[PDB]
Amino acid sequence: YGPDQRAQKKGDIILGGLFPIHFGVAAKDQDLKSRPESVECIRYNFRGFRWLQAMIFAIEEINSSPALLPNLTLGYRIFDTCNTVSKALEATLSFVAQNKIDSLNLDECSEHIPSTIAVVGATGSGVSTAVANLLGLFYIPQVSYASSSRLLSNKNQFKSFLRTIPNDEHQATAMADIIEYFRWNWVGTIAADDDYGRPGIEKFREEAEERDICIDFSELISQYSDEEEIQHVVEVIQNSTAKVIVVFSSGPDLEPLIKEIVRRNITGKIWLASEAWASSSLIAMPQYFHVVGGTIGFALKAGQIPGFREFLKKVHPRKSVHNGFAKEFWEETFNCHLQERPLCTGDENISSVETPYIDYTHLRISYNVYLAVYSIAHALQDIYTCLPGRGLFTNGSCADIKKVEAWQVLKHLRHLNFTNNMGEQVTFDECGDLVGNYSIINWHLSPEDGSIVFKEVGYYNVYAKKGERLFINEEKILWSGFSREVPFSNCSRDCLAGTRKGIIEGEPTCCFECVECPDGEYSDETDASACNKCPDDFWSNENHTSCIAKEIEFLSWTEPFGIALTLFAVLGIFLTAFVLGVFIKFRNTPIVKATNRELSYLLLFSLLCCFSSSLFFIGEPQDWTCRLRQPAFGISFVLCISCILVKTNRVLNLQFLLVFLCTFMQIVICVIWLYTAPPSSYRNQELEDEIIFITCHEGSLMALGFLIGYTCLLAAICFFFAFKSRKLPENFNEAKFITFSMLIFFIVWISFIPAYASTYGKFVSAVEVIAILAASFGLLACIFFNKIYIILFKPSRNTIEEV
Amino acid sequence: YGPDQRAQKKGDIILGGLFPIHFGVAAKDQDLKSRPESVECIRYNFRGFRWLQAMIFAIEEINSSPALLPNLTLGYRIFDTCNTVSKALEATLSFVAQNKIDSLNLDECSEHIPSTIAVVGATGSGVSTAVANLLGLFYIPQVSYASSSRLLSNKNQFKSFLRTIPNDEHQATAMADIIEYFRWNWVGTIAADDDYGRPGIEKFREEAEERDICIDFSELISQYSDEEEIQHVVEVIQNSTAKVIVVFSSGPDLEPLIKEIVRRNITGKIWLASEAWASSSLIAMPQYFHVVGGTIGFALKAGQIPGFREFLKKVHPRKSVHNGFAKEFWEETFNCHLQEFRPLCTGDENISSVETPYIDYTHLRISYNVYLAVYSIAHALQDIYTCLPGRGLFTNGSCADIKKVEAWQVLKHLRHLNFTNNMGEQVTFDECGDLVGNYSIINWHLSPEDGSIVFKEVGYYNVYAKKGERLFINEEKILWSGFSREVPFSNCSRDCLAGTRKGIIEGEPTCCFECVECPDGEYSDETDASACNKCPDDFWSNENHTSCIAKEIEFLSWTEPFGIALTLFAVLGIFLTAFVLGVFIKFRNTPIVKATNRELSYLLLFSLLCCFSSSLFFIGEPQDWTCRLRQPAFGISFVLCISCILVKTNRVNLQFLLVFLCTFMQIVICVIWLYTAPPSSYRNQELEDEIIFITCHEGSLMALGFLIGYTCLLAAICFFFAFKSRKLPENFNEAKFITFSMLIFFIVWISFIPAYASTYGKFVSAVEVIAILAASFGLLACIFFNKIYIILFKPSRNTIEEV
Ligand SMILES: *[C@@H]1O[C@H](CO)[C@@H](O[C@@H]2O[C@H](CO)[C@@H](O)[C@H](O)[C@H]2NC(C)=O)[C@H](O)[C@H]1NC(C)=O
Ligand SMILES: *[C@@H]1O[C@H](CO)[C@@H](O[C@@H]2O[C@H](CO)[C@@H](O)[C@H](O)[C@H]2NC(C)=O)[C@H](O)[C@H]1NC(C)=O
Ligand SMILES: *[C@@H]1O[C@H](CO)[C@@H](O[C@@H]2O[C@H](CO)[C@@H](O)[C@H](O)[C@H]2NC(C)=O)[C@H](O)[C@H]1NC(C)=O
Ligand SMILES: *[C@@H]1O[C@H](CO)[C@@H](O[C@@H]2O[C@H](CO)[C@@H](O)[C@H](O)[C@H]2NC(C)=O)[C@H](O)[C@H]1NC(C)=O
Ligand SMILES: C[C@@H](NCCCc1cccc(C(F)(F)F)c1)c1cccc2ccccc12
Ligand SMILES: C[C@@H](NCCCc1cccc(C(F)(F)F)c1)c1cccc2ccccc12
Ligand SMILES: N[C@@H](Cc1c[nH]c2ccccc12)C(=O)O
Ligand SMILES: N[C@@H](Cc1c[nH]c2ccccc12)C(=O)O
Ligand SMILES: *[C@@H]1O[C@H](CO)[C@@H](O)[C@H](O)[C@H]1NC(C)=O
Ligand SMILES: *[C@@H]1O[C@H](CO)[C@@H](O)[C@H](O)[C@H]1NC(C)=O
Ligand SMILES: *[C@@H]1O[C@H](CO)[C@@H](O)[C@H](O)[C@H]1NC(C)=O
Ligand SMILES: *[C@@H]1O[C@H](CO)[C@@H](O)[C@H](O)[C@H]1NC(C)=O
Ligand SMILES: *[C@@H]1O[C@H](CO)[C@@H](O)[C@H](O)[C@H]1NC(C)=O
Ligand SMILES: [Ca+2]
Ligand SMILES: [Ca+2]
Ligand SMILES: [Ca+2]
Ligand SMILES: [Ca+2]
């Protein structure tokens, strides 16, 4: 009844089992020249035999214990799948022989042909899919220990499939979390071309696309990939700059690629291993460690089966009548031949040979096999202890254990809730899945043995909230097996401050160019997509990483030039005040009485007014400061000129009013300009990019020009009268002064436009304040220095009458 | 045995058949409260029954024709799959009952049914995978007509699977070609969660990422997706700006989402339908044309089966004894209930009256595939029949006995099959059991006459062409979204412009970008650009940053309002100096001119000539020869003038020797400065970025400073020697006039310091060409004015009048 090599025992209820005892089938090409024969299997699987023994041990433990299924013995019929759909399908056809016989009406034997109540499912997800398609026809519940494909959660197609292993959605999310944790964004993916690698790679692709992770390459491999595809994938890996490779595959499918990569000696790659090969003895070979060393993988939660190791050590080909795979196990363990290659004596010790069979540190899928067997057993017990009237069937009817059927066991397995030997609650959700934690391991080299050790470096809590599932202790991770520094696996290096991201055409967003910011903008953060513009009166620092205020530039009172000009003007005001004091003190003197005593007082008052008005130009330019800047000096200077002309007006109450009339025109022009186009406070920043120049535009230039021309007119009118008086030195020869006053005014303000009409910053104010001070000082000196010297420094020479 | 309803005919050779006569199973909630009864099917599939009739017609035509398998009749055993794995697996168990009895050795019915030797395959790719897993166990060939998944090309798993339909790799490549043809880069993808949609959308993902197409979303749908999943898919669809949605699905799995989208009235989307639902009656209903109208899809090559339509029209529930589905076909067509409230089927109705997809077709595409699969099996059988011994395909050149043929021999002959179909083309399966074929491209329109959706051919796909030339599309025949004739826009962002660049948006793919404007000095001219280009020197970016123009050259020259005035003033000065020379030359034999010196005055006049001429050296564009002597020219000339003028004072021919000695040191230092480090025409571009100044350097700046210092010291010495001589009225008090000349020169060459230091550019030569001639005028119009005016108009007031 099916394959010759089997492990079967009799009992009241028979449970089927499918384990990979070989890694695959012989690669003999069927040319169909002769009728095809059964294809042999090649490489023994000690781990798979351990899984089979876990199933057998669980069933024997159940039978020994009288508290679970009293007066009912459990049987089994376990076959070898060789990781192939064909072998497992032959075994499954053996399993459903009675169900198919009765459904197909082909009986038109009963004691023989035992009926399988439940099947402990396959390892591979494709194998489990193929088996479940046939098993769901008859509603035989199938509990898998290792198939973690999310495609088996579809209960519309797989009506009777449950599993004691978490499906791969959480594992793909966990790999995405691992990549996000180490700040990687340039990765490549490799997956097996089966129902396991493809959905997991797809889920990882979705998760990583969410987290702004860029996948450089994505290739598919298989156990039967020929030289061309393996070479192509090797070249794809070699060309890629991504160091982190995410692999969703098993051992047998990844073996050819790893062998080729070792042959071509590709090093420096970081491998993110799925659970199927993270603990695989096919790839964790020491000779491959220079390639696959430092692999970060996933491992399920380890379980505790108390008397399991003794059961494993007790296997013997002669004393294992029920287990048929024991003979081949002995032959492959001790490298001999059994007769019912040397001849095995049958007295060897399995502890003297190193194999995965007993040289294990954690039971992960073995505990899953145990849990699946115990789940079926507990469902059967729930059937047995059903109190009538409270059943799960129609009208609360309870099934009979003496005539139980597969669909009733399946119904009870859906509503199953029991506690395992580790105290945890074992329950299948609406999709038949069994959620569980993940462990995180790293591949190291054992210094004492030279083999590969799996060092736990973290875990993955599936019961935590999003973003709190992953914990990694990076201090325990040896990158590439030797290093202690986190590798760089970004497409491009980060852009520093003052630099932005530039697009590389035809490449993902993770690959960019660093472009310096323009001089008008800045960028402070690392890896910024744009340079923020410097706002308001700010400018960019020489490295465009900060904003620096645009310097406001002006003639300050505290500035050295401003200090000098203010002190010089104050000294002039003090000097004219002193001259006034001497004049009033010595008012009773014929020399002063000879000149216009009262009018000279108005002249010197206007002189002091001009000296003070010179201080208007220096300082902070406000609207009021430069509103009365030009016209204050205008009126003061025209008043001084009018006073000088009237004092010299010897050719003529009639003098003070004449001066008032002369200054009335100037005051009228000034007030007309003020009411029409008042000067404003310019804020000129568009002269130097980094400097703000605060000036004061005169509003309408025509009014200022007209005022200046008018002042020149009242200067030239006095100049003509002064010129003719050079031959008449009557009042102590004042012709040499009045001519000199107009001359120095004209010279100072004619020798100053090249200095004036050259600057438009702050020197345009200092130069013109210097011009005002110089003209006023010249006027003061010429008019009053000689007169005050004659009055004071010449007391004896104080002649009563002049010429 | 097996399914109750079936089509069955007895013969020497029996062919299995799997057709989806129903669209699915009844949505029954299996609570397992009662023993699970066989689930029933609900919706009828007239296309599936047409396919079944195609198989039956092919077998009947083969039997009638004596040129194919003479003296041998073909039987069939055809079952309904209802698009479900379970029903097809029941049918496959019926198919392999005999083989599996032989293998299981359960025979420990003599002829329950003649052994099935071939099975014309299923429709769904998952259903075909499930059936092929079981059929490959017994090496029973399976020729599918519709399963086009690339997973079935794996001959390591599917040993006996062949198909008359091409796999979907070419169709996904064709979707990528269509997307790139209309220049889209922002598309969404929807696939069916089965073995057809998933690998197809994965191949499309690979191809689209190869062509720089960005996929926005990627969702999976199913016939049994609940309301939550459909709702989430709908919000994902309408939360996106991608207008093109590429769908790899069938009619049943896409119906729920389409119905929901119609319910929520989402319009404007472009549908890229795969072959499975491009012609689906489930989706092509007129109610949905406002959503799925204007769909661009794929279709295979239609084939011509001559007498097929008559065979379809000849169906009858009472004359078709072999066909068991004919009764249900009649019931579903005429909406009645045949004898064993709906009316009673009299059996005299006309099938041509009712509009069902049965005979209402325009192109047999999968029906031709069914016909071709049957004929492929028949031709392999014929090849077995007409084999001459010694020229066979088996071990010793032998071949099988057709009277006892086995399924594996038929499979072997099908691998090496090469025959010509009725249409005259070669039918052969490659190493993967695949038939390569062309694709057609159709568009969903609306028929104004009937309202039904019509599939208008708008292109094709040529899989026998070189890569890149496979796609051909006639856009003028495409009605976009069913009404519009404008190609839709489905890019993530609008394209940039010329004077702008691309800006990275963080978290969005490379197809989504900003349009940051290029900064000043850099330009771009392409439609889109990832970086701003900068042209080389002598060029600056335009006002729109599109192109960059020549950096205009700024310097002092002629033919401008400033240069013309300066050269006019220079020629005026040379004119008055020539006039003065003529006055001194004509009236040379007079005592007046022979007051200071009769000949040294001529040397001074020549020096003034040279000083005036040196002013034109500063007005030209600085060349090598220009300003290597421009400053030396004025230096030497003015030193000569001062050397003449201080000797011109009397009581100092030793005068010429003294003048030459004074000028010799200046000439020597000028020659030394010129030879050691000559000033060079330096190209200046640092003051203003948009324009370039052509200035010239000075070489040894300290040499120039020393030259001007020597000149000013000599002038100061001349002024000092005339400082204490204004009393004597020698030669009409020339001491006062030389004092005036020296003072004028000093004010002109001391008042330009702020102009020189502040302003840099073209107005550095202008301030020189206005000061040089001003100082020269002061020297000329003061020293010689007192003599030219004396002897110009007056009766020369002389003969030692004041000498
Ligand atoms: C590689 O790129 C990632 C981005 O994908 C960088 O991660 C960023 O790191 C900075 C500071 O370390 C964080 O402020 C960002 O939030 C991170 N971005 C993301 C998306 O998480 C990582 O730093 C880069 N590594 C190197 C070496 O440059
Ligand atoms: C799954 O992993 C989580 C996280 O490691 C485990 O939660 C821990 O449980 C132990 C014992 O109950 C506590 O002492 C710790 O404080 C928990 N850590 C947490 C909550 O972060 C959990 O026990 C594991 N197993 C299950 C079945 O949840
Ligand atoms: C597939 O499509 C191509 C192109 O549409 C077909 O090639 C045409 O073949 C006919 C005759 O067979 C020629 O008259 C045309 O000029 C061809 N068109 C081309 C090359 O563009 C081809 O016949 C179709 N079928 C197959 C099986 O290849
Ligand atoms: C959508 O984007 C694509 C590419 O992102 C644009 O296609 C480009 O079109 C221009 C001119 O038609 C060609 O020169 C390029 O070679 C095309 N690029 C590619 C990758 O094919 C398309 O024009 C855009 N459509 C818009 C903006 O409406
Ligand atoms: C202080 C000045 N306001 C603008 C200066 C224009 C200027 C700058 C440089 C040179 C010259 C000048 F040569 F034309 F004088 C004018 C001012 C205000 C009011 C009356 C004035 C009368 C005479 C002179 C200046 C006057
Ligand atoms: C033409 C003139 N070259 C100006 C040099 C810099 C400068 C620019 C503006 C002002 C001054 C100065 F006031 F300091 F002189 C110097 C020059 C050439 C050779 C000899 C000269 C002797 C006297 C004056 C000018 C002389
Ligand atoms: N999960 C894998 C099977 C698997 C899990 N762990 C393993 C360890 C070894 C071998 C296979 C496995 C699958 O679905 O195919
Ligand atoms: N190609 C589809 C089957 C298919 C083709 N055309 C169809 C039309 C209707 C229904 C199904 C189909 C698959 O792989 O499964
Ligand atoms: C990888 O690199 C090799 C050698 O540089 C080159 O021939 C090949 O085209 C590249 N790409 C792939 C996919 O192999
Ligand atoms: C392979 O590469 C490693 C570098 O890690 C080097 O140590 C070793 O010698 C190489 N071996 C061969 C056979 O190239
Ligand atoms: C869709 O967008 C709305 C608002 O525009 C938001 O509330 C909702 O969460 C989004 N859903 C999805 C699936 O994007
Ligand atoms: C659906 O939308 C179309 C156009 O977008 C409109 O003509 C029609 O009336 C709408 N129907 C309903 C029921 O909203
Ligand atoms: C099939 O046979 C024809 C001859 O009729 C030949 O031209 C063609 O090459 C053959 N095809 C193959 C794949 O051998
Ligand atoms: Ca028990
Ligand atoms: Ca690319
Ligand atoms: Ca025939
Ligand atoms: Ca994103």
Structure tokens at B253: 């799995």
Q: What is the resolution of this structure in A?
A: 2.7
Torsion of CA A752, A753, A754, A756, to 10 degrees: 90
Structure tokens at A277: 């090969």
B605 touches B659 (CB < 8 A): no
Residues of chain B with CATH 3.40.50.2300: 7-165+304-428, 169-299+437-477
Ligand nearest to the CA of B440: 3
> For B7-165+304-428, which CATH superfamily applies?
Response regulator (3.40.50.2300)
Interface contact B137, partner A, CB < 8 A: yes
Give the separation between CA A641 and CA A645, rounded to whole angstroms. 6
The partner residue sitting opposite A105, judged by closest CB among B1, B212, B516, is B1
Show which of residues 185-214 on chain B sit within 8 Å of chain A, judged by CB atoms.
193, 198-199, 202, 206, 212
Residue A148 annotated in ligand binding: yes
* Nearby residues of B286 by Cβ (< 8 Å), 6 or more positions away: B446, B451, B452, B453
From the CB of residue A712, how many other CB atoms can be counted at a distance below 10 Å? 14
Structure tokens at B133: 């897993």
Terminal Cα-to-Cα distance of chain B (whole angstroms):
157
Give the separation between CA B74 and CA B9, rounded to whole angstroms. 8
Interface contact B800, partner A, CB < 8 A: no
Give the separation between CA B235 and CA B216, rounded to whole angstroms. 13
Yes or no, beta carbons of B510 and A503 under 8 Å apart: yes
From the CB of residue B167, how many other CB atoms can be counted at a distance below 10 Å? 24
One-letter amino acid identity for A670?
Answer: C
Question: For residue B469, what are the CA distances in angstroms to A64, B167, B175, B475?
Answer: 72, 20, 14, 16
Enumerate the residues of chain A whose CB falls inside 8 A of the CB of residue B134: 89, 134
Nearest to A754 by CA among B759, B751, B563, B775: B751
B803 touches B730 (CB < 8 A): yes
Nearest to A383 by CA among A68, A116, A692: A68
From the CB of residue B360, how many other CB atoms can be counted at a distance below 10 Å? 13
Nearest to B55 by CA among B113, B132, B123, B150: B123
Residue A68 annotated in ligand binding: yes
Task: Output the residue whose Cα is nearest ligand 5's atom 12.
Answer: A749
CATH of the domain spanning B493-550: 2.10.50.30
Yes or no, beta carbons of A530 and B503 under 8 Å apart: yes
A371 touches A136 (CB < 8 A): no
* Nearby residues of A571 by Cβ (< 8 Å), 6 or more positions away: none
Give the separation between CA B90 and CA B85, rounded to whole angstroms. 9
Q: Which residues of A223-247 are buried (b: 16+ CB within 10 A; e: fewer)?
A: bbbeeebbeebbeebeeeebbbbbb
Give the separation between CA A642 and CA A644, rounded to whole angstroms. 5
Yes or no, beta carbons of A97 and B106 under 8 Å apart: yes
Determine the Cα angle at A722 with ends A720 and A725, to 5°. Answer: 115
Give the separation between CA A50 and CA A315, rounded to whole angstroms. 11
Structure tokens at B495: 């394209």
A6-23+39-165+306-386 is classed CATH 3.40.50.2300: yes
Give the separation between CA A715 and CA B80, rounded to whole angstroms. 122
How close is the Cα of A273 to the center of ligand 7, in Å? Answer: 12
The beta-strand segments (E) located in A593-752 are 682-684, 691-695
Taking phi over 0 as left and psi of -120 to 50 as alpha, with beta for the rest, B489 belongs to beta
Q: For ligand 9, what atom is nearest to the CA of residue A235?
A: 14
Q: Which residues of B745-756 are buried (b: 16+ CB within 10 A; e: fewer)?
A: bbbbbebbebbb
Give the separation between CA B105 and CA A175, rounded to whole angstroms. 49
The response to whether residue A235 sits with its C-beta less than 6 Å from ligand 9 reads: yes
Name the fold adopted by A560-793.
Answer: Rhopdopsin 7-helix transmembrane proteins (1.20.1070)
Determine the Cα angle at A731 with ends A730 and A732, to 5°. Answer: 95
Give the separation between CA B485 and CA B473, rounded to whole angstroms. 14
From the CB of residue A312, how many other CB atoms can be counted at a distance below 10 Å? 18
- What is the 3-class SS of B517-565, one letter each residue? ECCCCCECCCCCCCCCECCCCCEEECCCCCCEEECCEECCCCCCHHHHH
Give the DSSP per-residue string, B652-704.
--HHHHHHHHHHHHHHHHHHHHHHHS-----EE-SS-SSSEEE----SSHHHH
Give the separation between CA A616 and CA A630, rounded to whole angstroms. 9
Helices B734-750/B766-783 angle, 10° precision: 170
Give the separation between CA B762 and CA B557, rounded to whole angstroms. 9
Question: For residue A704, what are the CA distances in angstroms to A660, A676, A708, B300?
Answer: 21, 12, 6, 91
Which residue in chain B is spatially nearest to A207 when comparing CA positions? B218
* 3-state SS assignment for residue A157: coil
Interface contact B654, partner A, CB < 8 A: no
Beta bridge mates, B79: B18
The beta-strand segments (E) located in A214-269 are 214-221, 244-248
Yes or no, beta carbons of B106 and A89 under 8 Å apart: no
Which of A29, A85, A140 best tests the B interface by mutation, with the highest count of B CBs <10 A? A85
The beta-strand segments (E) located in A294-449 are 296-300, 417-419, 425-427, 438-445
How close is the Cα of B216 to the center of ligand 15, in Å? Answer: 16
From the CB of residue B344, how many other CB atoms can be counted at a distance below 10 Å? 10
Give the separation between CA A120 and CA A74, rounded to whole angstroms. 14
Question: For residue A557, what are the CA distances in angstroms to A617, A630, A759?
Answer: 10, 19, 20
Terminal Cα-to-Cα distance of chain A (whole angstroms):
159
The response to whether residue B290 sits with its C-beta less than 6 Å from ligand 12 reads: yes
Name the fold adopted by B169-299+437-477.
Answer: Rossmann fold (3.40.50)
Give the separation between CA B472 and CA B406, rounded to whole angstroms. 45
Kindly give the residue spans of alpha helices, DSSP state H, lying in B168-226.
Answer: 169-181, 197-210
B642 touches B718 (CB < 8 A): yes
Give the separation between CA B323 and CA B79, rounded to whole angstroms. 10
The beta-strand segments (E) located in B423-474 are 426-428, 439-446, 453-461, 471-473
CATH of the domain spanning A169-303+436-476: 3.40.50.2300
Structure tokens at A725: 């008086």
Show which of residues 334-393 on chain A sit within 8 Å of chain B, judged by CB atoms.
392-393
Kindly give the residue spans of alpha helices, DSSP state H, lying in A541-621.
Answer: 560-585, 590-594, 597-613
Residue B168 annotated in ligand binding: yes
The partner residue sitting opposite A758, judged by closest CB among B409, B412, B758, is B758
Interface contact A111, partner B, CB < 8 A: no
User: Strands A532-533, A521-522: parallel, antiparallel or unpaired by DSSP?
Assistant: antiparallel
Tell the residue number behind the tokens 């002649």, with chain if given: A799
Yes or no, beta carbons of A763 and B747 under 8 Å apart: no
B605 touches B578 (CB < 8 A): no
Nearest to B39 by CA among B92, B90, B94: B90
Q: Element (H or E) spanning B216, and its range?
A: strand B214-221
Binning chain A into helix, strand and coil, the percentages to the nearest 5 are 45, 15, 40
Torsion of CA B412, B415, B416, B420, to 10 degrees: 120
**φ, ψ for residue A800 (rounded to 5)?**
-70, -45
From the CB of residue B531, how many other CB atoms can be counted at a distance below 10 Å? 16
Burial bucket for residue B263 (CB in 10 Å: 0-12, 13-18, 19+) = exposed
Experimental technique? cryo-EM
Beta bridge mates, A7: A78, A323
From the CB of residue B689, how many other CB atoms can be counted at a distance below 10 Å? 13
Question: For residue A276, what are the CA distances in angstroms to A437, A446, A769?
Answer: 15, 22, 90
**φ, ψ for residue A257 (rounded to 5)?**
-65, -40
Q: For ligand 8, what atom is nearest to the CA of residue B365?
A: 6
